[PDB]
């Protein structure tokens, strides 16, 4: 009896995308040129799959995510599957290899504003470029799917404020007068920036800017 041997001890990474129902990954074969039962190789996933999401077809050697099962990067981002090939000799001989599965991200999580709504109070005489607020956000995705962009979508009368798209820092953009406009109800919007902007997700909320009185 000869042991069934795999070409490589590790093969990877194999890209599988989250949200994708039961996809094939790849075929994995052990070499074993014995006769009869000493060369009947059976395959199985023996470690690394704690939620039961994967299976290898016992004769063909095709690893897949199970039928009707979708992977999720936010619960598990990577898998190290131990594959076993065992013959039907006595004793049964066996070998194992490792398969790395990288779970590729989709944009399946909205950004969230962390510190809005907020009410800020500034001098009516605050000069252009003065600090108003620092808007903050998080996103559970990775890569471009969690890269966040800010902008003011409503209530920014006579272009009176500016927000840096990258940082989320709101500053004064024009001169202000309390006797013209005492209060600004700004709608600040944070969005992610996926490859395809048709699936971009957002969060909106109020930044209220109230001007304190001064001389004239
Ligand atoms: Ca064998
Ligand atoms: Ca997910
Ligand atoms: Ca996202
Ligand atoms: Ca995701
Ligand atoms: Ca004034
Ligand atoms: Ca005044
Ligand atoms: K929200």
Swiss-Prot record:
Location of the protein in the cell: Cell membrane
Tissues showing expression: In adult animals relatively high levels of expression are found in testis, skeletal muscle, heart, eye and thymus, and lower expression in kidney, lung and brain. Found in the sensory hair cells of the inner ear.
Residues modified by glycosylation: 80, 119, 151, 164
Highest rank taxon of the organism: Eukaryota
Limits of the Cadherin domain: 7-113, 114-216
Record remark: domains: Three calcium ions are usually bound at the interface of each cadherin domain and rigidify the connections, imparting a strong curvature to the full-length ectodomain. Cadherin repeats 1 and 2 mediate calcium-dependent heterophilic interaction with PCDH15.
Subunit field text: Interacts with USH1C and USH1G. antiparallel heterodimer with PCDH15. Isoform C1: Interacts with CAMSAP3; leading to inhibit CAMSAP3 ability to induce microtubule bundle formation.
Disease named in the record: Defects in Cdh23 are the cause of waltzer (v) phenotype. Waltzer mice are characterized by deafness and vestibular dysfunction due to degeneration of the neuroepithelium within the inner ear.
Function per UniProt: Cadherins are calcium-dependent cell adhesion proteins. They preferentially interact with themselves in a homophilic manner in connecting cells. CDH23 is required for establishing and/or maintaining the proper organization of the stereocilia bundle of hair cells in the cochlea and the vestibule during late embryonic/early postnatal development. It is part of the functional network formed by USH1C, USH1G, CDH23 and MYO7A that mediates mechanotransduction in cochlear hair cells. Required for normal hearing.
Protein name: Cadherin-23
Species this chain originates from: Mus musculus
Gene transcribed to yield this protein: Cdh23
